[PDB]
Amino acid sequence: MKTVVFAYHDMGCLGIEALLAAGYEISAIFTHTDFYGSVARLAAERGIPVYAPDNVNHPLWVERIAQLSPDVIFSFYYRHLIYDEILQLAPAGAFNLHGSLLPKYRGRAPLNWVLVNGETETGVTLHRMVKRADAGAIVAQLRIAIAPDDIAITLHHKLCHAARQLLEQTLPAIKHGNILEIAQRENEATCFGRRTPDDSFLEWHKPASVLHNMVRAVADPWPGAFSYVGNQKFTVWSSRVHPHASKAQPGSVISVAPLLIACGDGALEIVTGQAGDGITMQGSQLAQTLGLVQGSRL
Ligand SMILES: Nc1nc(=O)c2c([nH]1)NC[C@@H](CNc1ccc(C(=O)N[C@@H](CCC(=O)O)C(=O)O)cc1)N2C=O
Ligand SMILES: O=c1ccn([C@@H]2O[C@H](COP(=O)(O)O)[C@@H](O)[C@H]2O)c(=O)[nH]1
């Protein structure tokens, strides 16, 4: 079974590895220009031609892919929609690996959004690729738990592990044409967009648990959840929830050692953070750096 693969980052690398282990012949990999593994370096080491056009949806790339005669196409965290002109070239179709429990969390950054939203489970889905992103029939799915202390990077690794398992289990079935698919239930679908560093703003009126989830969702090496002291941005890199009710106004500094901020329900301890583009520091030092005192209002 011959394939053309669209791949990026760690999911891209493990998808390529899984295909090679399952005995697929990879004729070409399409990727993007740049902590993640490099699909291009993997392709190069494996002797596979690799290409990173900004937009693969060009007549000449369509023609080129056609000339490679793929049986099947895979996408493993390729970022750009691939037009029907390309997808229809492969007689056995096209499959994508998405990092959520479709039909929930279609779209961008499902790793981060499930954390933002306080989910206790997520998963990986392999589905047929169709014109609408993340919307085609499901062929395999694997559910995993999100632990209360998971952060983006730790959940990322768990999703990668799950993807490897799912692919190892499923790729042989595709190769042999055993491949039941079930349509997604559109009434159950949810979809999320690209996140910017700004979508990680901490709003202190929210429950401490919700703010904690935001901190986890974009913890290092993601860009971090943030607030301000006047013109001074600061990032909360790690936190802990103090569930006890405070009579303090949301955003009030309850204490500076440890740095504890009243929320809409409970309080949030800022365990580590940074002021602006300065270095990471413990919360008590951050408090001093920012000029906060007990009773300061954020
Ligand atoms: N045909 C096809 N189907 C897919 O499911 C699929 C591909 N291609 N290619 C790789 C990838 C692309 N996934 C996505 C996911 C979301 C958007 C999206 O919502 N785009 C918005 C907003 C701008 C943006 O985020 O790019 C839009 O209005 O198009 C696009 C592509 N993908 C499966 O992962
Ligand atoms: O919750 C998120 C998820 C991603 N990004 C940004 O989205 C881009 C895509 O990230 P990759 O998807 O991590 O490249 C990067 O600039 C990344 O920092 C955020 O700001 N917040």
mmCIF file of C-alpha atoms and ligand atoms in Angstrom:
data_model
loop_
_atom_site.group_PDB
_atom_site.id
_atom_site.type_symbol
_atom_site.label_atom_id
_atom_site.label_comp_id
_atom_site.label_asym_id
_atom_site.label_seq_id
_atom_site.Cartn_x
_atom_site.Cartn_y
_atom_site.Cartn_z
ATOM 1 C CA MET A 1 0.000 0.000 0.000
ATOM 2 C CA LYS A 2 1.411 3.301 -1.226
ATOM 3 C CA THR A 3 0.736 6.574 0.483
ATOM 4 C CA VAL A 4 1.306 10.292 0.368
ATOM 5 C CA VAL A 5 1.420 11.787 3.809
ATOM 6 C CA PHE A 6 0.696 15.246 5.140
ATOM 7 C CA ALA A 7 2.344 15.629 8.525
ATOM 8 C CA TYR A 8 3.734 18.041 11.074
ATOM 9 C CA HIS A 9 5.086 18.011 14.572
ATOM 10 C CA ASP A 10 5.049 15.076 16.994
ATOM 11 C CA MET A 11 1.793 13.565 15.725
ATOM 12 C CA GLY A 12 3.272 13.823 12.238
ATOM 13 C CA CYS A 13 6.424 12.017 13.234
ATOM 14 C CA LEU A 14 4.618 9.195 15.066
ATOM 15 C CA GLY A 15 2.144 8.824 12.206
ATOM 16 C CA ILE A 16 4.988 8.397 9.715
ATOM 17 C CA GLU A 17 6.689 5.927 12.017
ATOM 18 C CA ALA A 18 3.464 3.956 12.428
ATOM 19 C CA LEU A 19 2.905 3.819 8.677
ATOM 20 C CA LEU A 20 6.442 2.576 8.097
ATOM 21 C CA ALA A 21 6.059 -0.029 10.836
ATOM 22 C CA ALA A 22 2.778 -1.206 9.286
ATOM 23 C CA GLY A 23 4.569 -1.691 5.957
ATOM 24 C CA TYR A 24 3.182 1.238 4.010
ATOM 25 C CA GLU A 25 5.342 2.745 1.270
ATOM 26 C CA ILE A 26 5.559 6.462 1.726
ATOM 27 C CA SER A 27 6.274 8.179 -1.589
ATOM 28 C CA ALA A 28 6.258 11.752 -0.328
ATOM 29 C CA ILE A 29 5.646 13.777 2.758
ATOM 30 C CA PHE A 30 4.149 17.260 2.776
ATOM 31 C CA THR A 31 4.883 19.388 5.764
ATOM 32 C CA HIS A 32 5.366 22.980 6.866
ATOM 33 C CA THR A 33 8.367 25.214 7.384
ATOM 34 C CA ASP A 34 9.009 26.033 11.080
ATOM 35 C CA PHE A 35 10.048 21.341 21.272
ATOM 36 C CA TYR A 36 8.267 19.229 18.648
ATOM 37 C CA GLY A 37 9.892 16.567 16.493
ATOM 38 C CA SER A 38 10.678 17.562 12.946
ATOM 39 C CA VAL A 39 8.775 15.732 10.241
ATOM 40 C CA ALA A 40 11.265 17.051 7.661
ATOM 41 C CA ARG A 41 14.230 15.645 9.558
ATOM 42 C CA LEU A 42 12.463 12.307 9.913
ATOM 43 C CA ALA A 43 11.666 12.218 6.215
ATOM 44 C CA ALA A 44 15.249 13.129 5.406
ATOM 45 C CA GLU A 45 16.660 10.384 7.667
ATOM 46 C CA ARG A 46 14.251 7.842 6.201
ATOM 47 C CA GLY A 47 15.060 8.791 2.632
ATOM 48 C CA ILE A 48 11.595 10.037 1.787
ATOM 49 C CA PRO A 49 11.120 13.110 -0.430
ATOM 50 C CA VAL A 50 9.688 15.934 1.616
ATOM 51 C CA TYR A 51 8.110 19.152 0.534
ATOM 52 C CA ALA A 52 6.807 22.211 2.332
ATOM 53 C CA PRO A 53 4.930 24.439 -0.077
ATOM 54 C CA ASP A 54 2.964 27.151 1.601
ATOM 55 C CA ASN A 55 -0.114 26.036 -0.282
ATOM 56 C CA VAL A 56 -0.204 22.545 -1.613
ATOM 57 C CA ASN A 57 -3.516 23.236 -3.358
ATOM 58 C CA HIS A 58 -1.863 24.173 -6.630
ATOM 59 C CA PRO A 59 -2.443 22.468 -9.951
ATOM 60 C CA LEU A 60 1.188 21.462 -10.165
ATOM 61 C CA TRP A 61 1.222 19.850 -6.727
ATOM 62 C CA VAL A 62 -2.035 18.057 -7.602
ATOM 63 C CA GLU A 63 -0.442 16.779 -10.743
ATOM 64 C CA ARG A 64 2.692 15.754 -8.848
ATOM 65 C CA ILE A 65 0.779 13.878 -6.128
ATOM 66 C CA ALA A 66 -1.266 12.129 -8.817
ATOM 67 C CA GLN A 67 1.922 10.967 -10.490
ATOM 68 C CA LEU A 68 3.014 9.343 -7.206
ATOM 69 C CA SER A 69 0.002 6.970 -7.435
ATOM 70 C CA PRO A 70 -1.002 6.903 -3.752
ATOM 71 C CA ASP A 71 -3.464 4.243 -2.730
ATOM 72 C CA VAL A 72 -4.330 6.203 0.370
ATOM 73 C CA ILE A 73 -3.623 9.591 1.879
ATOM 74 C CA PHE A 74 -2.996 10.362 5.526
ATOM 75 C CA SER A 75 -2.913 13.588 7.454
ATOM 76 C CA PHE A 76 -1.180 13.728 10.817
ATOM 77 C CA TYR A 77 -1.438 17.272 12.151
ATOM 78 C CA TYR A 78 -0.995 18.992 8.818
ATOM 79 C CA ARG A 79 -2.481 22.410 9.315
ATOM 80 C CA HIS A 80 -3.977 23.373 6.000
ATOM 81 C CA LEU A 81 -7.140 22.141 4.343
ATOM 82 C CA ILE A 82 -6.336 19.802 1.486
ATOM 83 C CA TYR A 83 -8.636 20.252 -1.449
ATOM 84 C CA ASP A 84 -10.860 17.599 -2.840
ATOM 85 C CA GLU A 85 -8.731 17.579 -6.002
ATOM 86 C CA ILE A 86 -5.938 16.000 -3.988
ATOM 87 C CA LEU A 87 -8.024 13.824 -1.673
ATOM 88 C CA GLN A 88 -9.888 12.186 -4.559
ATOM 89 C CA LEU A 89 -6.657 10.978 -6.144
ATOM 90 C CA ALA A 90 -6.355 8.042 -3.728
ATOM 91 C CA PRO A 91 -8.664 5.090 -4.436
ATOM 92 C CA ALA A 92 -8.725 3.973 -0.802
ATOM 93 C CA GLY A 93 -9.410 7.515 0.361
ATOM 94 C CA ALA A 94 -7.940 9.820 2.876
ATOM 95 C CA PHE A 95 -7.748 9.701 6.668
ATOM 96 C CA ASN A 96 -6.874 12.224 9.355
ATOM 97 C CA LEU A 97 -5.771 11.820 12.927
ATOM 98 C CA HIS A 98 -7.375 14.386 15.214
ATOM 99 C CA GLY A 99 -6.565 14.939 18.864
ATOM 100 C CA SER A 100 -10.057 14.876 20.347
ATOM 101 C CA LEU A 101 -13.145 12.693 20.800
ATOM 102 C CA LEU A 102 -14.896 13.756 17.617
ATOM 103 C CA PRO A 103 -17.452 15.095 17.055
ATOM 104 C CA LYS A 104 -16.461 17.130 20.083
ATOM 105 C CA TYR A 105 -13.570 19.551 19.693
ATOM 106 C CA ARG A 106 -13.358 19.741 15.965
ATOM 107 C CA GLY A 107 -10.969 22.420 14.802
ATOM 108 C CA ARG A 108 -7.853 23.945 16.177
ATOM 109 C CA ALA A 109 -5.914 23.347 19.351
ATOM 110 C CA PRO A 110 -8.030 20.561 20.881
ATOM 111 C CA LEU A 111 -5.232 19.874 23.325
ATOM 112 C CA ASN A 112 -5.567 23.288 24.829
ATOM 113 C CA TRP A 113 -9.323 23.664 24.578
ATOM 114 C CA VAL A 114 -10.125 20.472 26.488
ATOM 115 C CA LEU A 115 -7.971 21.803 29.345
ATOM 116 C CA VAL A 116 -9.482 25.270 29.185
ATOM 117 C CA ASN A 117 -12.939 23.689 29.463
ATOM 118 C CA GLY A 118 -12.091 21.384 32.326
ATOM 119 C CA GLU A 119 -12.735 18.146 30.567
ATOM 120 C CA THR A 120 -11.820 14.992 32.453
ATOM 121 C CA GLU A 121 -11.400 12.942 29.272
ATOM 122 C CA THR A 122 -10.214 13.452 25.730
ATOM 123 C CA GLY A 123 -8.853 11.157 23.071
ATOM 124 C CA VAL A 124 -7.757 10.653 19.509
ATOM 125 C CA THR A 125 -9.867 9.929 16.441
ATOM 126 C CA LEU A 126 -9.002 8.627 13.019
ATOM 127 C CA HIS A 127 -11.618 9.656 10.487
ATOM 128 C CA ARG A 128 -12.144 10.001 6.805
ATOM 129 C CA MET A 129 -11.030 13.368 5.486
ATOM 130 C CA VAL A 130 -13.666 15.331 3.792
ATOM 131 C CA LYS A 131 -14.121 18.896 2.730
ATOM 132 C CA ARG A 132 -15.214 20.198 6.158
ATOM 133 C CA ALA A 133 -12.433 20.000 8.712
ATOM 134 C CA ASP A 134 -12.602 17.141 11.148
ATOM 135 C CA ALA A 135 -16.073 16.112 10.006
ATOM 136 C CA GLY A 136 -15.746 12.815 8.166
ATOM 137 C CA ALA A 137 -16.790 9.382 9.200
ATOM 138 C CA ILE A 138 -15.032 7.936 12.199
ATOM 139 C CA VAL A 139 -13.019 4.781 11.767
ATOM 140 C CA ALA A 140 -11.358 4.530 15.171
ATOM 141 C CA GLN A 141 -11.343 6.363 18.457
ATOM 142 C CA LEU A 142 -9.502 6.011 21.737
ATOM 143 C CA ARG A 143 -10.480 7.767 24.985
ATOM 144 C CA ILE A 144 -7.993 8.792 27.642
ATOM 145 C CA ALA A 145 -8.279 10.422 31.037
ATOM 146 C CA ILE A 146 -7.134 13.926 31.802
ATOM 147 C CA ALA A 147 -5.625 14.017 35.274
ATOM 148 C CA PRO A 148 -6.199 17.017 37.497
ATOM 149 C CA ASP A 149 -2.504 17.861 37.365
ATOM 150 C CA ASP A 150 -2.085 17.415 33.633
ATOM 151 C CA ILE A 151 -0.899 20.470 31.778
ATOM 152 C CA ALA A 152 -0.673 21.003 28.052
ATOM 153 C CA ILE A 153 2.683 19.269 27.606
ATOM 154 C CA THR A 154 1.817 16.237 29.716
ATOM 155 C CA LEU A 155 -1.543 15.792 27.997
ATOM 156 C CA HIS A 156 0.247 16.248 24.674
ATOM 157 C CA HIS A 157 2.423 13.266 25.420
ATOM 158 C CA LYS A 158 -0.599 11.208 26.477
ATOM 159 C CA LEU A 159 -2.408 12.075 23.243
ATOM 160 C CA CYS A 160 0.680 11.067 21.257
ATOM 161 C CA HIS A 161 0.842 7.754 23.094
ATOM 162 C CA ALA A 162 -2.849 7.135 22.396
ATOM 163 C CA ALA A 163 -2.361 8.023 18.736
ATOM 164 C CA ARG A 164 0.456 5.524 18.438
ATOM 165 C CA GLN A 165 -1.766 2.824 19.925
ATOM 166 C CA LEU A 166 -4.732 3.690 17.751
ATOM 167 C CA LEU A 167 -2.594 3.699 14.602
ATOM 168 C CA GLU A 168 -0.890 0.453 15.426
ATOM 169 C CA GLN A 169 -4.309 -1.098 15.862
ATOM 170 C CA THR A 170 -6.009 0.512 12.880
ATOM 171 C CA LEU A 171 -3.436 0.860 10.111
ATOM 172 C CA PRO A 172 -3.407 -2.887 9.375
ATOM 173 C CA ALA A 173 -7.195 -2.821 8.963
ATOM 174 C CA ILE A 174 -6.960 0.035 6.488
ATOM 175 C CA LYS A 175 -4.226 -1.735 4.568
ATOM 176 C CA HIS A 176 -6.453 -4.804 4.175
ATOM 177 C CA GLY A 177 -9.636 -2.836 3.478
ATOM 178 C CA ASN A 178 -11.369 -3.684 6.750
ATOM 179 C CA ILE A 179 -12.701 -0.354 7.604
ATOM 180 C CA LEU A 180 -16.014 0.279 8.916
ATOM 181 C CA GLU A 181 -16.827 3.919 9.279
ATOM 182 C CA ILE A 182 -19.622 5.630 11.194
ATOM 183 C CA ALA A 183 -20.871 9.087 10.377
ATOM 184 C CA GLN A 184 -20.436 11.777 12.953
ATOM 185 C CA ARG A 185 -23.563 13.063 14.682
ATOM 186 C CA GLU A 186 -23.668 16.702 13.641
ATOM 187 C CA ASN A 187 -26.025 17.619 16.444
ATOM 188 C CA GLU A 188 -23.263 16.632 18.908
ATOM 189 C CA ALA A 189 -20.400 18.434 17.211
ATOM 190 C CA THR A 190 -18.446 21.236 18.821
ATOM 191 C CA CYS A 191 -15.770 23.284 17.117
ATOM 192 C CA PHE A 192 -13.046 25.580 18.242
ATOM 193 C CA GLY A 193 -10.837 28.072 16.570
ATOM 194 C CA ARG A 194 -7.232 29.054 16.597
ATOM 195 C CA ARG A 195 -6.021 30.289 19.899
ATOM 196 C CA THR A 196 -3.818 33.309 20.155
ATOM 197 C CA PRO A 197 -1.690 34.082 23.148
ATOM 198 C CA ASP A 198 -4.466 36.657 24.054
ATOM 199 C CA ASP A 199 -7.255 33.931 24.581
ATOM 200 C CA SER A 200 -5.319 33.028 27.710
ATOM 201 C CA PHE A 201 -6.249 36.169 29.616
ATOM 202 C CA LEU A 202 -7.207 35.448 33.228
ATOM 203 C CA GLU A 203 -10.474 37.048 34.337
ATOM 204 C CA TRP A 204 -10.504 37.020 38.123
ATOM 205 C CA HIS A 205 -14.325 36.998 38.415
ATOM 206 C CA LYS A 206 -14.337 33.408 37.227
ATOM 207 C CA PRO A 207 -14.119 30.427 39.555
ATOM 208 C CA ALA A 208 -10.613 29.608 40.718
ATOM 209 C CA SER A 209 -10.978 26.170 39.152
ATOM 210 C CA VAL A 210 -11.673 27.672 35.735
ATOM 211 C CA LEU A 211 -8.658 29.982 35.978
ATOM 212 C CA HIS A 212 -6.491 27.104 37.121
ATOM 213 C CA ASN A 213 -7.631 25.194 34.038
ATOM 214 C CA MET A 214 -6.549 28.093 31.857
ATOM 215 C CA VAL A 215 -3.112 28.124 33.494
ATOM 216 C CA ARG A 216 -2.775 24.391 32.826
ATOM 217 C CA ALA A 217 -4.018 24.720 29.267
ATOM 218 C CA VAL A 218 -1.206 27.014 28.150
ATOM 219 C CA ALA A 219 1.566 26.198 30.588
ATOM 220 C CA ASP A 220 5.164 26.216 29.324
ATOM 221 C CA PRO A 221 6.102 25.568 26.538
ATOM 222 C CA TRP A 222 2.827 27.197 25.525
ATOM 223 C CA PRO A 223 2.637 30.961 25.949
ATOM 224 C CA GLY A 224 1.072 31.080 29.413
ATOM 225 C CA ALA A 225 -2.017 32.515 31.028
ATOM 226 C CA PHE A 226 -1.712 36.141 31.978
ATOM 227 C CA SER A 227 -3.065 39.164 33.772
ATOM 228 C CA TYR A 228 -1.851 42.682 34.370
ATOM 229 C CA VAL A 229 -0.750 45.016 37.118
ATOM 230 C CA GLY A 230 -1.397 48.319 35.377
ATOM 231 C CA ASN A 231 0.748 48.486 32.250
ATOM 232 C CA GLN A 232 2.706 45.469 33.447
ATOM 233 C CA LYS A 233 1.779 42.111 31.957
ATOM 234 C CA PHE A 234 2.499 39.056 34.013
ATOM 235 C CA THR A 235 2.206 35.410 33.259
ATOM 236 C CA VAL A 236 1.021 32.676 35.630
ATOM 237 C CA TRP A 237 3.028 29.617 34.765
ATOM 238 C CA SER A 238 1.689 27.352 37.547
ATOM 239 C CA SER A 239 -1.092 27.577 40.070
ATOM 240 C CA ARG A 240 -3.050 25.858 42.820
ATOM 241 C CA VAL A 241 -6.693 26.184 43.754
ATOM 242 C CA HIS A 242 -7.686 27.154 47.305
ATOM 243 C CA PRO A 243 -11.368 26.275 47.352
ATOM 244 C CA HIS A 244 -12.363 28.080 50.553
ATOM 245 C CA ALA A 245 -14.754 31.064 50.145
ATOM 246 C CA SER A 246 -13.123 34.534 50.451
ATOM 247 C CA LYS A 247 -15.067 37.732 51.281
ATOM 248 C CA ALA A 248 -12.440 39.559 49.205
ATOM 249 C CA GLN A 249 -13.246 41.061 45.855
ATOM 250 C CA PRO A 250 -12.289 38.963 42.881
ATOM 251 C CA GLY A 251 -8.806 39.973 41.808
ATOM 252 C CA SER A 252 -7.779 41.014 45.300
ATOM 253 C CA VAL A 253 -4.365 39.955 46.553
ATOM 254 C CA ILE A 254 -5.166 37.942 49.664
ATOM 255 C CA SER A 255 -1.490 37.293 50.424
ATOM 256 C CA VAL A 256 1.897 37.739 48.801
ATOM 257 C CA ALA A 257 3.665 34.827 50.415
ATOM 258 C CA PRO A 258 2.239 32.716 48.917
ATOM 259 C CA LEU A 259 0.789 34.904 46.192
ATOM 260 C CA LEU A 260 -2.944 34.204 46.428
ATOM 261 C CA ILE A 261 -5.580 36.002 44.367
ATOM 262 C CA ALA A 262 -9.294 35.925 45.259
ATOM 263 C CA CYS A 263 -11.455 34.605 42.420
ATOM 264 C CA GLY A 264 -15.182 34.465 41.886
ATOM 265 C CA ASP A 265 -15.218 31.232 43.871
ATOM 266 C CA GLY A 266 -12.212 30.258 45.932
ATOM 267 C CA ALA A 267 -8.732 31.684 45.347
ATOM 268 C CA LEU A 268 -5.837 30.972 43.029
ATOM 269 C CA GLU A 269 -2.289 30.596 44.282
ATOM 270 C CA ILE A 270 0.274 31.795 41.739
ATOM 271 C CA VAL A 271 3.057 29.303 42.298
ATOM 272 C CA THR A 272 5.349 30.532 39.515
ATOM 273 C CA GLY A 273 5.142 33.256 36.891
ATOM 274 C CA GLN A 274 7.014 36.076 35.180
ATOM 275 C CA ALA A 275 6.708 39.819 34.783
ATOM 276 C CA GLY A 276 6.598 40.811 31.153
ATOM 277 C CA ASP A 277 9.486 39.243 29.243
ATOM 278 C CA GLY A 278 11.467 38.766 32.417
ATOM 279 C CA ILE A 279 12.497 35.484 33.901
ATOM 280 C CA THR A 280 10.300 32.967 35.644
ATOM 281 C CA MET A 281 10.183 33.318 39.415
ATOM 282 C CA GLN A 282 8.272 32.002 42.399
ATOM 283 C CA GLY A 283 5.020 33.777 43.162
ATOM 284 C CA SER A 284 6.248 35.651 46.203
ATOM 285 C CA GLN A 285 9.132 37.128 44.201
ATOM 286 C CA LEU A 286 6.782 37.895 41.343
ATOM 287 C CA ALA A 287 4.585 39.797 43.768
ATOM 288 C CA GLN A 288 7.503 41.999 44.777
ATOM 289 C CA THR A 289 8.671 42.465 41.202
ATOM 290 C CA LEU A 290 5.173 43.659 40.233
ATOM 291 C CA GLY A 291 4.756 45.898 43.284
ATOM 292 C CA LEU A 292 1.801 43.974 44.701
ATOM 293 C CA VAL A 293 0.812 44.075 48.340
ATOM 294 C CA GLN A 294 -1.986 42.489 50.313
ATOM 295 C CA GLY A 295 -5.152 44.227 49.180
ATOM 296 C CA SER A 296 -3.876 45.217 45.746
ATOM 297 C CA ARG A 297 -6.660 44.859 43.187
ATOM 298 C CA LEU A 298 -6.167 43.195 39.819
HETATM 299 N N1 LIG B 1 -9.860 18.397 3.504
HETATM 300 C C1 LIG B 1 -9.313 18.345 4.686
HETATM 301 N N2 LIG B 1 -10.042 17.937 5.778
HETATM 302 C C2 LIG B 1 -9.511 17.901 7.050
HETATM 303 O O1 LIG B 1 -10.255 17.512 7.988
HETATM 304 C C3 LIG B 1 -8.203 18.306 7.204
HETATM 305 C C4 LIG B 1 -7.511 18.705 6.045
HETATM 306 N N3 LIG B 1 -8.066 18.754 4.828
HETATM 307 N N4 LIG B 1 -6.199 19.101 6.132
HETATM 308 C C5 LIG B 1 -5.444 19.070 7.391
HETATM 309 C C6 LIG B 1 -6.478 19.408 8.381
HETATM 310 C C7 LIG B 1 -6.852 20.819 8.479
HETATM 311 N N5 LIG B 1 -7.678 21.167 9.628
HETATM 312 C C8 LIG B 1 -8.277 22.341 9.763
HETATM 313 C C9 LIG B 1 -9.004 22.618 10.937
HETATM 314 C C10 LIG B 1 -9.668 23.819 11.065
HETATM 315 C C11 LIG B 1 -9.646 24.745 10.052
HETATM 316 C C12 LIG B 1 -10.468 26.022 10.239
HETATM 317 O O2 LIG B 1 -11.359 26.074 11.096
HETATM 318 N N6 LIG B 1 -10.248 27.021 9.433
HETATM 319 C C13 LIG B 1 -11.158 28.178 9.631
HETATM 320 C C14 LIG B 1 -10.505 29.391 10.316
HETATM 321 C C15 LIG B 1 -9.048 29.694 10.044
HETATM 322 C C16 LIG B 1 -8.128 28.582 10.513
HETATM 323 O O3 LIG B 1 -8.199 28.187 11.705
HETATM 324 O O4 LIG B 1 -7.362 28.153 9.635
HETATM 325 C C17 LIG B 1 -11.917 28.397 8.299
HETATM 326 O O5 LIG B 1 -12.843 29.241 8.271
HETATM 327 O O6 LIG B 1 -11.580 27.678 7.331
HETATM 328 C C18 LIG B 1 -8.946 24.446 8.863
HETATM 329 C C19 LIG B 1 -8.270 23.245 8.724
HETATM 330 N N7 LIG B 1 -7.499 18.451 8.482
HETATM 331 C C20 LIG B 1 -7.729 17.804 9.585
HETATM 332 O O7 LIG B 1 -7.103 18.045 10.629
HETATM 333 O O1 LIG B 2 -3.776 27.446 23.466
HETATM 334 C C1 LIG B 2 -3.022 27.816 22.566
HETATM 335 C C2 LIG B 2 -2.601 26.965 21.510
HETATM 336 C C3 LIG B 2 -1.726 27.505 20.580
HETATM 337 N N1 LIG B 2 -1.296 28.841 20.629
HETATM 338 C C4 LIG B 2 -0.394 29.379 19.568
HETATM 339 O O2 LIG B 2 -0.963 28.877 18.327
HETATM 340 C C5 LIG B 2 0.159 28.669 17.399
HETATM 341 C C6 LIG B 2 0.038 27.219 16.902
HETATM 342 O O3 LIG B 2 0.670 26.292 17.833
HETATM 343 P P1 LIG B 2 1.247 24.790 17.401
HETATM 344 O O4 LIG B 2 -0.322 24.526 17.028
HETATM 345 O O5 LIG B 2 1.594 24.694 18.995
HETATM 346 O O6 LIG B 2 2.153 25.527 16.453
HETATM 347 C C7 LIG B 2 1.449 28.923 18.182
HETATM 348 O O7 LIG B 2 1.899 30.262 17.966
HETATM 349 C C8 LIG B 2 0.992 28.770 19.632
HETATM 350 O O8 LIG B 2 1.807 29.520 20.538
HETATM 351 C C9 LIG B 2 -1.732 29.674 21.649
HETATM 352 O O9 LIG B 2 -1.370 30.847 21.707
HETATM 353 N N2 LIG B 2 -2.585 29.137 22.634
#
